Amino acid sequence: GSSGSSGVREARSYILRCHGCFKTTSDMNRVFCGHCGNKTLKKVSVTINDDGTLHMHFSRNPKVLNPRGLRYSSGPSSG
Numbered sequence: 001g002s003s004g005s006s007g008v009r010e011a012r013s014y015i016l017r018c019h020g021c022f023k024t025t026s027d028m029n030r031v032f033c034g035h036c037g038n039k040t041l042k043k044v045s046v047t048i049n050d051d052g053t054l055h056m057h058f059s060r061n062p063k064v065l066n067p068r069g070l071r072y073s074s075g076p077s078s079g
């Protein structure tokens with residue numbers, strides 16, 4: 001399948017990521033949501049890869065951690 005190419009302008013592939021549900025819908029004009037039905041949508045940028053994946057750089061979150069433990073064993077006494 002032949003394929004040509006001509007002057008390509010600057011393109012900014014973006015998307016709207018909901019909150020209450022956190023769902024993304026292909027639309028940069030819509031004001032409402034479908035997943036849940038929120039009345040507010042936040043604009044977020046997205047990168048494209050040869051393969052075709054979406055990456056959204058988010059702000060690290062506070063993920064605390066708990067202390068670890070250890071295991072032991074035992075055996076006979078005599079005989």
Ligand SMILES: [Zn+2]
Binds near residue numbers: 018
């Ligand atoms: Zn929603």
